[PDB]
Amino acid sequence: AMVFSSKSLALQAQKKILSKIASKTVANMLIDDTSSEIFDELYKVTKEHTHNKKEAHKIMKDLIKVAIKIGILYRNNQFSQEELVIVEKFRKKLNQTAMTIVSFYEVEYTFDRNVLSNLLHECKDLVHELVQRHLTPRTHGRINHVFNHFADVEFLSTLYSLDGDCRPNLKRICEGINKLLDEKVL
Amino acid sequence: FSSKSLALQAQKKILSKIASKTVANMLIDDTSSEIFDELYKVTKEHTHNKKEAHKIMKDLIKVAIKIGILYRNNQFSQEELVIVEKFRKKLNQTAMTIVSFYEVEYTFDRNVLSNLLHECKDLVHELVQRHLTPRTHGRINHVFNHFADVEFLSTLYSLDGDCRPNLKRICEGINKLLDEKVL
Numbered sequence A: 001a002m003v004f005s006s007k008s009l010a011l012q013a014q015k016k017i018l019s020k021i022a023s024k025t026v027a028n029m030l031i032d033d034t035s036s037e038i039f040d041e042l043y044k045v046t047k048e049h050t051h052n053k054k055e056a057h058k059i060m061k062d063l064i065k066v067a068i069k070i071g072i073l074y075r076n077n078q079f080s081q082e083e084l085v086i087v088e089k090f091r092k093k094l095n096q097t098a099m100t101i102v103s104f105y106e107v108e109y110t111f112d113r114n115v116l117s118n119l120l121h122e123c124k125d126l127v128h129e130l131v132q133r134h135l136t137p138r139t140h141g142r143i144n145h146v147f148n149h150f151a152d153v154e155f156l157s158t159l160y161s162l163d164g165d166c167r168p169n170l171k172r173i174c175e176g177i178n179k180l181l182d183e184k185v186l
Numbered sequence B: 001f002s003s004k005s006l007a008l009q010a011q012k013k014i015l016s017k018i019a020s021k022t023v024a025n026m027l028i029d030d031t032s033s034e035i036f037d038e039l040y041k042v043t044k045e046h047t048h049n050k051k052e053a054h055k056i057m058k059d060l061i062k063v064a065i066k067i068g069i070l071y072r073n074n075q076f077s078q079e080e081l082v083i084v085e086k087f088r089k090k091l092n093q094t095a096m097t098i099v100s101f102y103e104v105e106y107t108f109d110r111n112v113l114s115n116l117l118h119e120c121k122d123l124v125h126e127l128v129q130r131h132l133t134p135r136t137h138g139r140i141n142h143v144f145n146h147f148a149d150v151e152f153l154s155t156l157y158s159l160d161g162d163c164r165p166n167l168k169r170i171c172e173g174i175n176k177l178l179d180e181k182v183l
């Protein structure tokens, strides 16, 4: 009874396309197991700091979304020349802040929450510049929600404070970060 | 909580959304899907092999989609982008000729249209030559050798045949896409 339909053929092909995507994605994640681990730790710290399991989940969800968005733009060459210049700037800034985080951990007396806050703000601004010509509905707000939370001096003080209960987390975080610096992911 | 799980999800989702929007813009469109449906009808009426018509349209749709995805994902190199522009111009020219040959009966030259179609084929081959799967090449050939075939075109344009209403619809659709600057 059903007659020929090109729409049907197209949707049939799309089925296979979507399966292949599922595969490729599983085999080539934009986010490393190491990068994810760091994310789980920032998650736990976020929990302890906000005592709001769901605000934590929201924050991390958003962060992962923005990250994935940037990764997809960069993998699909959506970035212009100017924008690639901004990608490099962001690479540098991110390297600086990661080493600053690790150093504030490994070397006591050096931790300044204002310095690290300032750096994270610089990261945020770079991300904004990066997605200006590519901004979906929810993004801008996700960017601010994530980076304002991580550059809040009190979150940082919580993460680093010795008289706290995150020390172990900050450690695994810095271990991860050092792995990524080594592999030159960061 | 597993960031790895949320990241898996999110990446799959964005990639999938992109893929399906590409498919929708290309083929799901009403005017476009109707044109392809008519092309099916005319190739069935020309071959009297339902199955073979289906195969032709299926290769057409597979190649069309493959190219749509290479395009949206910026998978084409600079030279390749030169070739895409050339292909859009050649495809535009052949659309306009399809329409003119119909609108003005006496000006129908099956060899002109055929040669335009082979030009399109050459440009498609040139365009995907570095992005082949083990079957793309032959699909391109099957489709274009079928539509460029002078006998096919004669069946399509024959004023005494039964493909005239199809042709008229095909040309209506084509005119729509021309006006929308799709084609």
Ligand SMILES: [Cl-]
Pocket (backbone or CB within 6 Å): A136, A137, A138, A139
């Ligand atoms: Cl969104």
Ligand SMILES: [Cl-]
Pocket (backbone or CB within 6 Å): B076, B077, B078
């Ligand atoms: Cl290139």
Ligand SMILES: [Cl-]
Pocket (backbone or CB within 6 Å): none
């Ligand atoms: Cl005559």
Ligand SMILES: [Cl-]
Pocket (backbone or CB within 6 Å): B110, B154
């Ligand atoms: Cl004739």
Ligand SMILES: [Cl-]
Pocket (backbone or CB within 6 Å): B157, B158, B159, B160
């Ligand atoms: Cl005739």
